[PDB]
Curated annotation (Swiss-Prot):
Record's function text: Autophagy factor required for autophagosome formation. Stabilizes ATG13, protecting it from proteasomal degradation.
Molecular function as annotated in GO: identical protein binding; protein kinase binding; protein-containing complex binding
Highest taxon listed in the record's lineage: Eukaryota
Alphabetized InterPro entries for the sequence: ATG101 (IPR012445)
Location in or out of the cell: Cytoplasm; Preautophagosomal structure
Keyword annotations of the record: Autophagy, Cytoplasm
Protein name: Autophagy-related protein 101
Impact reported for I152D: Abolishes interaction with ATG13
């Protein structure tokens, strides 16, 4: 169950934070998901289809690929949205970080609790600058697009480089490994959190599925 933590750092403009974080999160979840398991008798199962689609960025000259799932997209857009607000609207040095953590549920023996054991952590350290000039914004569109392109391919190589994946679960064990709550995709169990540190202190936000 060797856990690996990877760190990515990006410097963007305020209007680029949301799209930049979405590119990273969707890219990771693209390679950390499966189709929905449809179980039959004797505990056997088939696997549903998962489409993908290109996403054109409006504030960055870049295009990324995400899982064709509105449910997942709305989930990610929400937490990235909270992050973008908490980060941009801060009187610090424009620094914050977001973590994507994949974990397994080791159900603590009846009846007390349930423990989350992480096996992969993906952290994005964001440095955001607020620009007013239209020209500078244009420079950032091209500049960030190049860097972000290099980092997406890089992150795909890193995921491929990781030697550990959870053992494929049986029907009774599927909810300890996968998020089986989405309609059209089945990612590994994941939680997303972010923290912003200011001159006043540190704020930490954790988001949980229903």
């Amino acid at each position: 169950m060797n856990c690996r933590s990877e760190v990515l750092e990006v410097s963007v403009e305020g209007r680029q934070v949301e799209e930049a974080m979405l590119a990273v999160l969707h890219t990771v979840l693209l390679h950390r998901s499966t189709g929905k398991f449809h179980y039959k008798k004797e505990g056997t199962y088939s696997i549903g289809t998962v489409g993908t689609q290109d996403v054109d960025c409006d504030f960055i000259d870049f295009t990324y690929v995400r899982v064709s799932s509105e449910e997942l997209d709305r989930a990610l857009r929400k937490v990235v949205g909270e992050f973008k607000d908490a980060l941009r609207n801060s009187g610090g040095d424009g620094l914050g970080q977001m973590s994507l953590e994949f974990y397994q549920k080791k159900k603590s023996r009846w009846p007390f609790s349930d423990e989350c054991i992480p096996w992969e952590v993906w952290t994005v350290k964001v440095h955001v600058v607020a620009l007013a000039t239209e020209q500078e914004r244009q420079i950032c569109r091209e500049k960030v697009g190049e860097k972000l392109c290099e980092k997406i391919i890089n992150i795909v190589e890193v995921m491929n480089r990781h030697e550990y994946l959870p053992k494929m679960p049986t029907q009774s064990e599927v909810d300890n490994v996968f998020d089986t709550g989405l309609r059209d995709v089945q990612p590994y169990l994941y939680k997303i959190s972010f923290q912003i540190t200011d001159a006043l202190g540190t704020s930490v936000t954790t988001t949980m599925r229903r």
